């Protein structure tokens, strides 16, 4: 709730103040003058724990708040940027974008709501990716994972596209970086997901609703298989056994979709007369068939398995 942070008028006032401070920093920098980001940092209210929901977290409920984030990062140092990431991960369940992108809390999102989710995904996740790829050590990445696991219902976060993608980024970065602390932290994360891994795949009624609003012929689930690939890759054999068991029905459902597309391709390609529209139809079927093969193989190959010629076998 917006009232748990000071209300709509207070947060909108904070955003306007943030913009004023960024415009001043940008003007000073452009004119080749000295810059002091103290006023801008203070206008963000990150160290402010006066409210049930931090004012920075509520600012992220608005497009204006989201859109200024890369520009904010141009004027901050490493520890300030890390404090922002720590705040985001600490209050991730209170983030409106998580509630909007979760099929559990928002089973029927409007087109406007879907656009907000795509915006947060494009801007915020690109910032997190760049920062962790360049300015983060083992302790700091481990710290962010612990912030996520200790302050949130991790299973609820996985019902959200943003939540799932944020976890994939942390896991993938941790995997690139001893073995020991990461094995322990991966296991704590695995505990919060165990018996609930199937819940990362949204219901069919949810997919239908999104597909109808976006004019999608197929639901894009590449991010789910990317998460499963990163979870499997950092896991021991026992973790992999559990993952495969929990998503077995989803593996077979994807194979069925790919096989239905292969049949459609065969039926349409044998037609003698082929207009530009039928060629568009065939190219669309082949693209979506190969997409399902590739997304599933991203997950399978990691465990030394492969889906080829209608069967899963050893790689």
């Amino acid at each position: 709730n917006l009232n748990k942070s000071g209300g709509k008028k207070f947060i909108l006032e904070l955003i306007e103040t943030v913009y004023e401070e960024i415009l001043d920093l940008e003007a000073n920098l452009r004119n080749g003058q000295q810059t002091d980001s103290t006023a801008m940092w203070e206008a963000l209210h990150i160290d402010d724990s006066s409210y049930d929901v931090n004012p920075f977290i509520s600012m992220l409920s608005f497009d204006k708040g989201i859109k200024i984030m890369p520009r904010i990062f141009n004027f901050l140092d490493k520890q300030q940027k890390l404090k922002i990431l720590q705040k985001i991960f600490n209050e991730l369940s209170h983030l409106q974008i998580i509630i909007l992108s979760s099929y559990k809390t928002t089973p029927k999102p409007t087109l406007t709501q879907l656009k907000k989710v795509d915006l947060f995904q494009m801007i915020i996740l690109k910032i997190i990716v760049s920062f962790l790829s360049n300015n983060s050590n083992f302790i700091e990445i481990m710290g962010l994972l612990l912030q996520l696991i200790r302050n949130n219902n991790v299973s609820f976060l996985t019902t959200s596209k943003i939540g799932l993608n944020l976890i994939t980024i942390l896991i993938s970065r941790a995997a690139l970086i001893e073995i020991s602390t990461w094995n322990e932290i991966y296991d704590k994360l695995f505990t919060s997901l165990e018996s609930k891994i199937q819940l990362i795949f949204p219901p069919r009624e949810y997919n239908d609703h999104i597909m109808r609003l976006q004019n999608d012929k197929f639901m894009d689930e590449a991010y789910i298989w990317a998460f499963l690939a990163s979870l499997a890759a950092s896991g021991k054999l026992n973790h992999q056994r559990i993952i495969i068991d929990e998503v077995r029905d989803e593996i077979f459902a994807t194979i069925n979709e790919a096989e239905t597309l292969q049949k459609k391709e065969k039926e349409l390609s044998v037609l003698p007369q082929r207009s530009q529209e039928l060629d568009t139809e065939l190219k669309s079927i082949i693209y979506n068939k190969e997409k399902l093969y590739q997304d599933l193989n991203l997950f399978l190959n990691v465990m030394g398995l492969v889906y080829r010629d209608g069967e899963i076998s050893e790689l």
């Binding site: 054999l237 992999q240 056994r241 495969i244 077995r248 465990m303 030394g304 398995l305 050893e314």
Partner: peptide, 14 residues
Amino acid sequence: SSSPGQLLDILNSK
């Protein structure tokens, strides 16, 4: 390291 052996079987078994 031999993960494909058992994993392929668990994917069918249950």
